[PDB]
Design a protein around this ligand. Sequence first.
Ligand SMILES: Cn1nc2c(=O)n(CC3(O)CCN(C(=O)C[C@H](c4ccccc4)C(F)(F)F)CC3)cnc2c1-c1ccc(CN)cc1
Length: 357
Amino acid sequence: SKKHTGYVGLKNQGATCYMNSLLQTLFFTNQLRKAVYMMPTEGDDSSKSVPLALQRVFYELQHSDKPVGTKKLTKSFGWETLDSFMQHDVQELCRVLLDNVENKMKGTCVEGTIPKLFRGKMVSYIQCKEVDYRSDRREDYYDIQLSIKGKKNIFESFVDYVAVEQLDGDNKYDAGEHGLQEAEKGVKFLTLPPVLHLQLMRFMYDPQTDQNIKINDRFEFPEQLPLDEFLQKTDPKDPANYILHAVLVHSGDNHGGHYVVYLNPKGDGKWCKFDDDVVSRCTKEEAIEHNYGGHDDDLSVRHCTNAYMLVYIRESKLSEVLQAVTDHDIPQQLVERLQEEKRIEAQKRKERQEHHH
Ligand SMILES: Cn1nc2c(=O)n(CC3(O)CCN(C(=O)C[C@H](c4ccccc4)C(F)(F)F)CC3)cnc2c1-c1ccc(CN)cc1
C-alpha cells in the first residue's frame, strides 16, 4: 500500500534480478523523469519502444496505487530471461536504458539531459620517467567501478582508484621509437557529475573456483562524501560534496538471491526500503550501516547481504536533480496514449483468455 510511504512498488515478475532496484533509482532522479516524459513517442510501437515503455513505468510509478508491472519494458529491450540479467552488470542495464532515452531526446527540448546528469570527465595517462613522452586518453564516464577488496571505505577506494602505478622491471611501457621505458600510469578525475553512480566491485574472478564469486567483505560508505581531493583542479564556488541518495542491495550468493533498494528520494535523510511490491519506511541505519556487510569477527551466519551500488548527488545540484514533479510535467498527449495502451492491453488479455479457455 502506497498509503504508508507515498511511494508504490514494482511487481516481482520473471527473473529480472537488479532491474526493479535500478528502475526506482532512476524514477527518483526527478530531473531525468521529467525529461523522459518529454520524449516524442507518439509515433512509437509499444512492443518495441524502450522510450515509451520507460514512460509507462515512470507514469505508473507516479500515479498507480498498485504495484507496477515491467513485462512490456523487458520485452522492449529484449532481456526476457534470467540469462540476460546474468550476462550483464547493473551498469550495463543502466546504459541500455539511458542511451535509449538520450537518443530519443535528440532534437527535443530535453536533448542533453543524460550527459548533463550523469557524465563526468577523466583522463588516463602513462608518463615516461626517463624520456619526454606522455600518452593522454580523455574519456567520458557515466559510472565508476570502485575496488573494495582490502579497502575499508569509499575514501580508501577513491585513493586506490587514482593511485599511481609503476611500470618498471619486466612491466616496462612500450614507448614506441623510445623503446621499452620505465613509466607511471594513472587516472585523474577532471569532473564529477551531478548524479554519481558507483558500483562496488563485489563480483570478483576467483582462480580456485574458476568463475566470478560474490565477495561479502565489510565495506563502509558515508551519508556525506567529500571528493574535492580526487579532482585535478577543484572549484571554490562548487566543491565536490556528495549526498547519499540510493543504496542498491543484494542478499545471497547468486542471481536467485534477493534484490532491494533503499532510497531517501528527497535527499533529506528520510529513507524507505523498496522490496518489489512492498515499500516501507526504514531507519537511516537500516539503509546505510546495515548494508556495509557483516563483521568478520561474527561467525553466527553467512553475511551475504550488502550494498553493490550507491547513488550520490552533488550538494550544489541536489535541489535541481530532485526538483519537484507534478501532474503538469506529464503531457496530456502521453497521458492519453498511456490510457489507450491500457485499453489495448485490457483487450489483448480477453482475446488470449478466449482462445485458451
Ligand atoms: C569487478 N566488478 N564487480 C562488480 C560488481 O559486483 N558489480 C555489481 C553487479 O553488476 C550487480 C549485479 N550482479 C549480480 O546481480 C550478481 C550477484 C551479485 C554480485 C555482487 C554483488 C551483488 C550481487 C551474484 F553474483 F549473483 F550474487 C553482478 C554484480 C558491478 N560491476 C562490477 C565489477 C566491474 C569492474 C570493472 C568493470 C570495467 N569497467 C566492469 C565491472
